[PDB]
Amino acid sequence: MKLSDLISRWIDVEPSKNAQIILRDRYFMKDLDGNYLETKWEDVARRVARVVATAELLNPSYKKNEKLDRIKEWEDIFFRVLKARLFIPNSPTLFNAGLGVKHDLLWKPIDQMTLEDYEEIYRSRNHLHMLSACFVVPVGDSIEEIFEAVKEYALITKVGGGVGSNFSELRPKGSFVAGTHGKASGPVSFMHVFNSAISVVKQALMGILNINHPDIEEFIDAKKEAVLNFFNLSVGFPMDKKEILKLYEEDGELELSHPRSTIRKKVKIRELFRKIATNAWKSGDPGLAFLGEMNKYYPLYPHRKINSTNPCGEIGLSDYEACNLGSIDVAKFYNNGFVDLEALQELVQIAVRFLDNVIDVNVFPIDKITKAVKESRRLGLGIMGFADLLYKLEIPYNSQEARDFAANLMAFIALHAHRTSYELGKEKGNFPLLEISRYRTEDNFVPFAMGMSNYDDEIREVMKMTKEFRRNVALLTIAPTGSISNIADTSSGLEPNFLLAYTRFVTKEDGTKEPLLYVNQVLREKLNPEILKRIEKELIEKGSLKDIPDVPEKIKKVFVVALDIDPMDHLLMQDAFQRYVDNNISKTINMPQSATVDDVLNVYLEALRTNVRGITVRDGSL
Amino acid sequence: MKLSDLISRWIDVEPSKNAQIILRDRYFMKDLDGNYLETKWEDVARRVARVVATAELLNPSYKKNEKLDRIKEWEDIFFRVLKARLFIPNSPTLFNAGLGVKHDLLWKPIDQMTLEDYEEIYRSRNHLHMLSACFVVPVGDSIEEIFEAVKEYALITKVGGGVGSNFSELRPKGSFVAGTHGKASGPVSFMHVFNSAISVVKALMGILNINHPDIEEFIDAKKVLNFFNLSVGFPMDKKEILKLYEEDGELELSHPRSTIRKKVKIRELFRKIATNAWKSGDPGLAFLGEMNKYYPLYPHRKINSTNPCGEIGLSDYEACNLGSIDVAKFYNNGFVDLEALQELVQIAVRFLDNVIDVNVFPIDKITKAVKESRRLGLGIMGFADLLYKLEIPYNSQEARDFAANLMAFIALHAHRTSYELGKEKGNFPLLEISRYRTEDNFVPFAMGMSNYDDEIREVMKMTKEFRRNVALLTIAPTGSISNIADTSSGLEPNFLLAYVNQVLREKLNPEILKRIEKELIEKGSLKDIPDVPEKIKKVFVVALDIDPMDHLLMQDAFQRYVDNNISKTINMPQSATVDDVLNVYLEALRTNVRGITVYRDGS
Ligand SMILES: Cc1cn([C@H]2C[C@H](O)[C@@H](COP(=O)(O)OP(=O)(O)OP(=O)(O)O)O2)c(=O)[nH]c1=O
Ligand SMILES: Cc1cn([C@H]2C[C@H](O)[C@@H](COP(=O)(O)OP(=O)(O)OP(=O)(O)O)O2)c(=O)[nH]c1=O
Ligand SMILES: Cc1cn([C@H]2C[C@H](O)[C@@H](COP(=O)(O)OP(=O)(O)OP(=O)(O)O)O2)c(=O)[nH]c1=O
Ligand SMILES: Cc1cn([C@H]2C[C@H](O)[C@@H](COP(=O)(O)OP(=O)(O)OP(=O)(O)O)O2)c(=O)[nH]c1=O
Ligand SMILES: [Mg+2]
Ligand SMILES: [Mg+2]
């Protein structure tokens, strides 16, 4: 099916009442007075499409005699895909597109648009026109660098970004400070300042400490009993995952040390791991960040180095680098028992361009970030709706079938994303740092592990072609998609549905407040409406269909939720996707309440054997 | 008595055992390995004197063929007064003089010193060579400016400065922020960030004006601002505010970047301040309008905050270095030796003004605001022990008349020295646009309690032409430096005679001393000890023998002849009431004080 046809099937389907609340709540633009400028998703799509299409002003392949034609064509395709809700960029794009721009230009009919109208939009983008979700800043070992970074956290947060740092540069607690004949506080104590800062710019953050830092144990325990309430915390592994797994298997020891300290200590790695697993088993923190694995696949490594992820972990970033995201709802690409690969390829094409255009209309609060992004042009195209896609295809999430499907789907998207990046480098110019990247200086560099798809050889072929032309350093991620999957009425990221049914309460102004039942749409349409009526009550009490009487087996096996899927099946699904993502992946390893700390440990060990770049894990713990 | 004679009398008097501990703990310089480079007070005086003398390198009145002998003469007079402990600069000067400089140059004998040795000292001052106690930075109404200011607090704190801000520029809690769907957190929430920053580098001053919509929240703030001293700012004239109170008027709380407006009864605001001050000692009162009344550079420049202790009101990014003369050492046969004193005032101003030229700050804007103004804070310590020696009770009109004359005299000669230094070295950059220039009978304090007034006016007129410094005077708390100098703190009464006071040892037999010693350490006074001569009781008063108004009136007598402000605690008995506090405030608004601190015993 052509994309245009699929667009027609969805373009007049309106967001559900649930989505509309979220849109009214945070997305619809308002004036200084608090009046709505936007009252319909369509108005958001109009504005966003117009602003991002405006980047086509910069397109060197266009003749002035042609420019307004082209810009208008991109505006309409971007508009049509956003309105149909087939692709949605990360929230900051939808919040901030067109801030600074006269309200007369953002929503007026495209037929009325002039070249000078598009140029005025370009011109009038204010310092709040920040369209990217993901940021990393360094935090260097000095009072001056720490507080410059606290300021940067504040500035980035103001404009709607999420920021992470590796704090390992900071000398351990108790170490010698020259200026003071005193003693250093250490990273964990400086992270409270970043926490206090942000908790006031918000009337989540990423903090990483490397496994060999002398304060690592303190770090691991930092969120137990949480002073760092705005931080997600991951333990950083800058060495190879193989070395770490080997050291564990031999019951080896790790030396904790720091260059600007005389503080040295030997710890049993098994013991470090158990402490991390015990804390993660209790509270969910800290996760694991396989920084070495990220650098394995970083085209610019070792010239440039990935030290931290953004707050949700899906983008590994070098210092001052940012990254903009967007997601395709692949549940909408289901057609009679197959995924419509024809319409999907056309959309991957459009999406890569939309995302790459976001960089040109993006305004960042810090010059070093502007420069880092211009230089690399890193994107994060991903998917949402994948669980609902498996439901439609009648595939159990917790099956080798699902993971095989997932790796092929991702491999196909990867293929056509990187092909589009090739085409864009040819059309608009390569990312400045192409020449010094492994796409150039190597033969056979691929930014992911592959090994689970028929498309591998074709992918290799595209990667070789991008030695010449390449618009972007990296193109892909799977994000959490909390809100944008809500807007799109679909399941989040690559995550299974957490629940098939819950009560979402609607506030009658006025009246009082209504108990409104949600049942998963795909469940509603496959399950016999009279079975639904019966079990509906038990499903809400129990959270699964598995021990409900008189629901056919095939419905129980297909309509699995997060907690029906055991930890390894979660882990292996992450692996399947990561093999064909050049950035990282947002995946919660959900674990049953009855899981032990050893069960967590075993996930970590398995994690070290698979291709995952990071780990997040237990029901009932928080 | 010549100053050289008075120097001879104290120069070989050794710091006490108490003082020596303090010196060893934090003043004696140490190397990277923790070994002492200095083992006695004289080593400190040597180093500090040499470094500050180095500023005479910059003196355009000296030929090069003269500079060496000149510098050496200054090093020597500086060394002698410091060693004698007759004048001691603020602590940062003691801690930080000579940082960055080869250890063979700092204690080497003065006769071996060459012009190149001095030039090397000058050149090798490092980024930590910060010698000033008092700082103010703005905190403007944007995320950018707030977090730059948090950065500045950290940087200033690192090098040993104390910093204050007026937070009033920050739009009130709940106000509209363009950037977001969120509302503004308010000055007070933001003050917690400053407090967190400092809690990791470590004391601070936070002011919020009386007409800020968040003022009541500010007043209640310390009822996790553990590092803040808090003062309510009064940018309006003290007259208007006292008038409004007396008329039971209302104040309009508003902010330019908020729609949040509210009316409160000023009397109710004051009662709420007094209630909290009554409980915990905070917040104090900062009469900003009154500081600006005597600010030579107002209104082109403006004083919005003080340093953490209140004694210097500072414009944005301005800093100020302090030094104190121990006036107890100037007692001679029933009189203050004004002859030696005038010589020291002369030397002290030069020392303090030289400190600017060898000072290094961590923020260019501070460097610039200090070069432009050259504000000094010359004060006194030892005052209370002076009153002991002179047999004057602190809580008497005699004491306050004494204090005003003494302060008047010091003012006279400091400002006369400022004029001389302007002629010698060049005027402060901003003289032309100051009220010393653009006005006729501008005087930077109220006066009205000394026969030196006409002479003071005459010197102020002279400083239309030549003037090295925008302002010269303060009374600081002098906690540590008065400990070093074995004397009483600032203008404060002694808090306690025994925990024994040396002037009390030298005056009471003993026998009566041996006997009463423990009763005086329980009761904390001589007041209700019988068999102590009435003359001894009257003179040897402590902080809490002196009622609140006598404290306040002593502050007023000094402030009349101080161009900056004054650090003074209004001590109150434990049985004082919230109405007793309010009465102190109302009296404060009628006197010439520029700020208020109260402390009720037992709080
Ligand atoms: C000054 C100071 C630094 N530090 C920490 C902050 C950084 O993690 C680290 C270095 O701070 P810096 O600001 O770099 O200290 P410095 O340059 O004076 O000393 P050094 O030559 O040893 O760098 O020490 C504290 O924890 N507390 C302090 O009071
Ligand atoms: C005001 C407000 C904003 N948001 C916004 C802030 C974020 O920009 C947005 C997240 O929406 P998504 O774009 O779905 O972000 P994500 O969950 O995919 O994660 P990533 O940050 O890695 O892209 O949610 C809330 O969740 N709740 C709120 O109350
Ligand atoms: C952004 C933001 C600002 N503020 C406060 C900080 C300052 O007191 C004040 C100004 O912040 P600003 O950073 O100036 O916000 P803006 O300039 O983009 O928009 P506006 O001019 O309308 O503010 O708002 C918050 O309290 N929380 C916030 O998240
Ligand atoms: C009284 C007293 C002061 N101090 C310290 C705190 C400071 O580090 C040190 C400063 O030297 P000071 O002589 O205290 O400076 P000051 O008190 O005049 O205050 P400022 O100049 O800021 O207006 O005094 C103690 O450590 N213990 C004490 O008992
Ligand atoms: Mg350093
Ligand atoms: Mg602003």
Spatial distance between the Cα atoms of B54 and B356, rounded to a whole number of angstroms: 11
Q: Give residue numbers after which chain B breaks (C–N above 2.5 Å).
A: 202, 223, 499
> Which residues, including other chains, have CB under 8 Å from residue B173's CB and lie 6 or more apart?
B183, B184, B185, B186, B188, B189, B213, B214, B217
What is the H or E stretch that residue A334 is in?
A: strand A334-335
The per-residue DSSP string of B227-271 comes to TEEEEEE--S-HHHHHHHHHTT-EEEE--TT----EEEEHHHHHH
Residue nearest atom 11 of ligand 3, based on CA coordinates: B142
Ligand 3 centre from B155 Cα, in Å?
A: 24
Tell me if B197 sits within 8 A of A185, measured CB to CB: no
CA distance A392 to B602: 75
Chain A residues inside the 8 Å CB shell of B144: 151, 155
- Do the beta carbons of residue B210 and residue B234 sit within 8 Å? yes
What SS3 state is found at A381?
strand
Best of B201, B227, B360 to substitute, by most chain A Cβ atoms within 10 angstroms, is B201
* φ, ψ dihedrals at B387, nearest 5°: -60, -40
Nearest CA in chain B to A34: B181
Lookup: tokens for A207: 């903090």
**Which run of H or of E encompasses A241?**
helix A241-249
Quick check: A159 and B144 CB within 8 A?
Answer: no
Residues of B in Cβ contact (< 8 Å) with A154:
143, 146-147
| DSSP letter for each residue of A400-446 | HHHHHHHHHHHHHHHHHHHHHHHHHHHHH---TTGGGSHHHH-SS--
A312 catalytic, yes or no?
yes
Give the span between the Cα atoms of A207 and A308, in whole angstroms: 8
The answer to whether residues B140 and B171 touch, using CB atoms and an 8 Å cutoff, is: no
Closest chain B C-alpha to A196 CA, distance in angstroms? 6
| Phi-psi domain of A40 (left: phi exceeds 0; alpha: psi -120 through 50; beta: other) | beta
What's CA B298's distance to the chain center, in Å? Answer: 21
Rounded Cα gap, residues A586 and A315, in angstroms: 9
CB contact under 8 A, B197 and A154: no
User: Annotated catalytic, A314?
Assistant: yes
Alpha helices, DSSP H, located in A268-334? 269-283, 291-296
Burial class (CB in 10 A: 0-12, 13-18, 19+), A426: middle
Phi-psi category of A320—alpha, beta or left, where left has phi over 0 and alpha has psi -120 to 50?
Answer: left
| Contact residues on chain B for A158, CB-CB shorter than 8 A | 143, 179-180
CB A396 within 8 A of CB A558: yes
Q: Do B143 and A155 touch (CB under 8 A)?
A: yes
Q: Could you give the CA distance from residue B194 to residue B137 in angstroms, rounded to a whole number?
A: 12
Crossing angle for the helix pair B578-590 and B266-280, to the nearest 10 degrees: 120
Task: Determine which residue's CA is closest to atom 12 belonging to ligand 3.
Answer: B142
**Among protein residues, the one whose CA lies closest to atom 15 of ligand 4:** B478
Domain ranges of chain B: 1-603
Ligand 2, atom 1, lies closest to the CA of: A26
CB contact under 8 A, A148 and B151: yes
Nearest to B150 among A150, A158, A178 (CB): A150
Take atom 14 of ligand 1 and give the residue whose Cα is closest: A142
CB-closest option in B146, B158, B196 to A193: B196
Half-sphere exposure of A140 (CA within 13 A, CB side): 7
The verdict on whether omega for the bond into residue B299 sits within 30 degrees of 0, i.e. cis, is yes
B477 upstream amide cis, omega within 30 of 0: no
Q: Which chain B residues contact residue A32 at CB under 8 A? A: 176, 178
The string of DSSP letters for A469-505 reads --S-S--B-B---HHHHHHTTS--TTPPPS-SEEEEE
Ligand with the closest atom to the CA of A200: 3
Query: Does residue B478 contact residue B379 with C-beta atoms inside 8 Å?
Result: yes
Find the angle CA(A617)-CA(A609)-CA(A413) to the nearest 5 degrees.
Answer: 80
Backbone angles phi, psi at B250, to 5 degrees: -120, 150
* Distance, CA of B545 to CA of B395 (rounded, Å): 8
Chain A segment 99-158 residues within 8 A of B by beta carbon are 128, 143-144, 146-148, 150-151, 154-155, 158
Nearest to B387 by CA among B569, B545, B561: B545
Torsion of CA A337, A339, A343, A344, to 10 degrees: 170
Task: Report CA-CA distances (Å) from B287 to A75, B237, B440, B565.
Answer: 60, 8, 25, 10
Residues A201, B128: C-beta atoms closer than 8 Å: no
Tell me which amino acid residue B157 is: T
- Rounded distance between C-alpha atoms, residue B151 and residue B133, angstroms: 18
CA B143 to ligand 6 center in whole angstroms: 7
Report the DSSP pairing between strands A287-289 and A614-615: antiparallel
Query: Can you tell me the distance from the alpha carbon of B407 to that of B557, in angstroms, rounded to the nearest whole number?
Result: 8
Closest CA to B6 of B82, B81, B89: B81
Mutual angle of helices A143-158 and A187-198, in 10-degree steps: 30
In CATH, what number does A1-622 get?
Answer: 3.20.70.20
State which residues have CB under 5 angstroms from ligand 5, the bound ion: A 142
Structural element, H or E, at residue A136: strand A134-136
Give every CB contact of residue B220 below 8 A, 6+ residues apart in sequence: B272, B276
Cα–Cα distance measured from residue A57 to residue A73, given in angstroms and rounded to the nearest whole number? 13
Q: Which helix (H) or strand (E) holds A380?
A: strand A379-384
How far apart (Å, rounded) are the C-alpha atoms in residues A479 and A121?
A: 29
What is the C-alpha to C-alpha distance for residues A184 and B197, in angstroms, rounded to an integer? Answer: 14
How far does Cα A284 stand from its chain's mean position? 19
Which contiguous run of DSSP H or E holds residue B319? strand B319-326
Q: Is the peptide bond before B510 cis (omega within 30 degrees of 0)?
A: yes
Number of alpha carbons in the 13 Å side-chain half-sphere of residue A568 = 7
B interface test, pick of A203, A227, A366, A367 with most B CB neighbours within 10 Å: A203
Distance CA B383, CA B479 (A): 13
Which chain B residues are Cβ-neighbours of A148 within 8 angstroms? Answer: 151
Fold of B1-603: Anaerobic Ribonucleotide-triphosphate Reductase Large Chain (3.20.70)
Separation between Cα atoms, residue A124 and residue A120, nearest integer Å? 6
Structure tokens, A431: 């990312």
B283 upstream amide cis, omega within 30 of 0:
yes
CA within 13 Å, CB half, B396: 14
SS3 A339: strand
**B248 Rama sector, left if φ>0, alpha if ψ -120 to 50, beta otherwise:** left
Residue A233 parent element (H or E): strand A231-236
CA dihedral of residues A307, A309, A313, A315 (deg, nearest 10): -110
Question: Is it true that the peptide bond before A187 is cis, omega within 30 degrees of 0?
Answer: no
Contact B78, B53 (CB under 8 A): yes
Taking the CA of residue A144 as reference, the ligand 1 atom at the shortest distance is: 13
**Three-state SS letters, A549-602:** CCCCHHHHHHCCCHHHCCHHHHHHHHHHHHCCCCCCECCECCCCCCCCHHHHHH
H-helix segments, B30-180:
41-53, 64-84, 91-96, 103-106, 115-123, 143-158
> Distance between CA A258 and CA A255 in Å, rounded?
10
| Torsion region of B404: left, alpha or beta (phi above 0 gives left; psi -120 to 50 gives alpha) | alpha
Q: If you search the block for the tokens 């309106």, which residue do you land on?
A: A14
Query: Which is catalytic among the residues A314, A321, A346, A495?
Result: A314
B197/A193 Cβ within 8 A? yes
Q: Which of B542, B564, B552, B560 is nearest to B588 (CA)?
A: B552
Using the mean position of ligand 4's atoms as its centre, give its distance from the Cα of residue B91 in Å: 7
